[PDB]
Amino acid sequence: RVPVIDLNRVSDEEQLLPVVRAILLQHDTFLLKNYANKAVLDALLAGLTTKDLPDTSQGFDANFTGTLPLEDDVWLEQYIFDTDPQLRFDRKCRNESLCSIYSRLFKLGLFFAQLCVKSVVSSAELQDCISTSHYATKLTRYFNDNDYVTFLPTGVLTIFPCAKAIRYKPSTNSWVSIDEPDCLLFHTGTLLARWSQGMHTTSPLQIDPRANIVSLTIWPPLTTPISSKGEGTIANHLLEQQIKAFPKVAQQYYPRELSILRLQDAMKFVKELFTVCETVLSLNALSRSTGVPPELHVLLPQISSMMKRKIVQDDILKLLTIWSDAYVVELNSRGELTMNLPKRDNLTTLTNKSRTLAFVERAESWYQQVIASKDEIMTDVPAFKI
């Protein structure tokens, strides 16, 4: 199940470090038991159910900060803060109740974040990336006016004051719900896994947005480079995560970034489709003896089954857009589309043996041409006209 740290048994840094480290080497999620202010914390959360309502006049900006109306009378209240005065992230939280929860979750979360880094991060220069003077936080509150959201946190760790209405993936596929109301829940983010350089891995979580969930995620300063081998920062990963969580907000504030992420899903789609089509066509060719190409409608159900989704004739035509010489697709005797492997060689097949690598290489090429051009980039691969 879930690793549990009892604070009445282990309370100081000397005791907690080997415990935290042993956990982090095999887990990304753990419970905090007997926290000295669990009662006060639970009282504050209870207060949020009837008072200190979300500021509906606040708006929701490009920093993914403010108040956002969701469906089913659910309200999101979120604040992203950074210690850097050069950054316009000045608000940690708003109302007295949320501020009290923040102060308790931060002091606790900052302590354990440093333990997490000390545990699985070898770089001495990264041992002090997070301090009381250098950090960034995201305080998230869901409010319900009387399904699960899947996300992958990107901080060092995310804390939940109550281990309730949250699902996770055991390290032993399938979601399992966590129901330990007397404990806080800790989950590590991708930054810790990344900086561990293989020592630690994390996993996505699931929450019920109608269960008044509160969470605090903690980072080093947002301007911190992810790695020496790149220019991407924590800000880039935070943005991508927030875009995936709130795509409609993204469509307004970050339309290009959204359309790229959507196009990448289309890329992933067409690559698997090609591999599936290769298998299906190869198998069908075995149940033949004469050079009569199969009608496309015959192949679709098998292709759809392997793709685990409905695949239409239009989808297969996307493959030709990426590589027109991939297949020979034409109308038959009775006006139905047929599909078969090419018989004759061209300059491509005379110089490249692998059909597998050929499609992948031309998929990325097509992908770059779209995102390098300044014309309105598409979110999908256009169907090749016959």
Residue numbers in the entry: 14 to 159, 186 to 211, 217 to 430
Manuscript excerpt for this entry:
The process of eukaryotic DNA replication begins during G1 phase with the loading of the minichromosome maintenance (MCM) heterohexamer comprising Mcm2–7 subunits into head-to-head double hexamers with double-stranded DNA passing through the length of a long central channel. This topological loading requires the Origin Recognition Complex (ORC), Cdc6 and Cdt1 proteins. We propose that Cdt1 stabilizes a conformation of the MCM ring in which the Mcm2–5 gate is held open to allow duplex DNA passage required for helicase loading. To understand Cdt1–MCM at an atomic level, we determined crystal structures of two non-overlapping fragments of S. cerevisiae Cdt1 spanning amino acid residues 1–438 and 495–604.
The fragment comprises a pair of well-defined domains corresponding to the N domain (residues 14–298) and the M domain (residues 299–430). The relative orientation between the domains is preserved in all four crystallographically independent copies of the protein chain observed in the crystal structures, indicating a rigid linkage between the domains. However, the key His and Asp residues involved in chelation of the Fe(II) ion co-factor in the active sites of these enzymes are not conserved in the Cdt1 N domain. Conversely, the N domain of Cdt1 projects away from the MCM ring and does not appear to be involved in any contact with the helicase motor. The N domain of the yeast protein plays an important role in MCM loading, but makes little or no contact with MCM in our structure.
